[PDB]
Amino acid sequence: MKRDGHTHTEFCPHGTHDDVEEMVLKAIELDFDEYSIVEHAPLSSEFMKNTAGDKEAVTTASMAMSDLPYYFKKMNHIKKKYASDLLIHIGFEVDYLIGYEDFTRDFLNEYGPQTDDGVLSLHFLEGQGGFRSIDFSAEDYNEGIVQFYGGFEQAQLAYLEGVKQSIEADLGLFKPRRMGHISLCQKFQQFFGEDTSDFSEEVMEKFRVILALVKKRDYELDFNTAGLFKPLCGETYPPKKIVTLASELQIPFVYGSDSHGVQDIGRGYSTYCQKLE
Ligand SMILES: [Fe+3]
Ligand SMILES: [Fe+3]
Ligand SMILES: [Zn+2]
Known part of the structure; x- marks a missing residue:
């Protein structure tokens, strides 16, 4: 399959x-x-x-709230048109917005019934001047988050704390059960002279706490290969070490290409398969 x-x-x-x-x-x-x-x-x-x-x-x-009706219409059309060749699921990559669970829960309670799959992802953290993006760009990430938290590792830990909160969050019956790219804090690794070969002991303990919790919640993880094709990253989300810990906990992984275009389709799939071994 x-x-x-x-x-x-x-x-x-x-x-x-x-x-x-x-x-x-x-x-x-x-x-x-x-x-x-x-x-x-x-x-x-x-x-x-x-x-x-x-x-x-x-x-x-x-997209805007007003685009929703059109989004579902188009996707439901593609779903049926190709049902013969592909089983298509329709849903959202839901942003876990720290401090805005009510909004998210309301959104999910309203549109959740029209969805068939989903991913819950952390993309914004509190930073310099207000909420900042984790994945927009190296310079933005540096000024808004890394410098705000005190350094790359400090940024990693604040990021994982956010991931932990997204897992613990009560977002209703329609809350996604697959956590998106849980090591997004590494997207601009090399710009900071960092890589996944030296996660500190504290960072590793947070990952263990996070994984144990994913298992207890019976959630699954997004094995995202987008990182293999980002200029300053070069790694899958998450890296092998985390994949191995998760597998040992029987936490399910679902390949995620995070495709935003035709050329992204299928990228890093072999890596996904091999990494699971
Ligand atoms: Fe994402
Ligand atoms: Fe995505
Ligand atoms: Zn996107």
């Missing part, structure tokens, strides 16, 4: 704007038999008033 549980569409402001249909055709060409469309859920309007850093990171983050 070949499944991709993390893909995006033309409804993504920062995507390549390729049509999801062309992405689905490519996935079929590459023998995938299960495919999930988890587009970025609209951010909280309140949340957007409390951010700092590059505005593009926010304005470009996701």
Whole structure:
């Protein structure tokens, strides 16, 4: 079986704007038999008033609430059109917004019924001047988060604390059960002269606490290969060491290409397969 549980569409402001249909055709060409469309859920309007850093990171983050009806219509159309070649799931990559669980829970309670899969991801942390992006750019990440927390490791620990909160969070019945790329704090590794070969003992303990909790919650993890194709990253989310700990805990992994265009489809799938061994 070949499944991709993390893909995006033309409804993504920062995507390549390729049509999801062309992405689905490519996935079929590459023998995938299960495919999930988890587009970025609209951010909280309140949340957007409390951010700092590059505005593009926010304005470009996701589609508007008004686009929702159109998103579901298009995706439900593609789902049926290709049901014969691919089992397509429709959902959202839901942003865990620290301090805004009510908003998220309300959003999920309303639109959750129209979804069939999902991913809960941490993309913003409190930083210099307000909420800051973890993945917009190396310079932005450095000024908004790394310097704010005191250093790369301090940033790692604040990031994992956020991941821990997203797992513990009560976001209703429709809360995603697959945690997105749980080592996103490494996306700009090399810009800080860092890599996954030397996670400190504290960082490792937080990962162990996080994993034990994922198991207890009976959640699963997004094995995201996007990192293998980012200039300053070069690693899968999460790295081998974490994958091994998770597997030993029988925590399920679902391959996630995090595709934002046709050319991303299927990327790093072999790595995913081998890394699980
Ligand atoms: Fe993400
Ligand atoms: Fe994504
Ligand atoms: Zn995206």
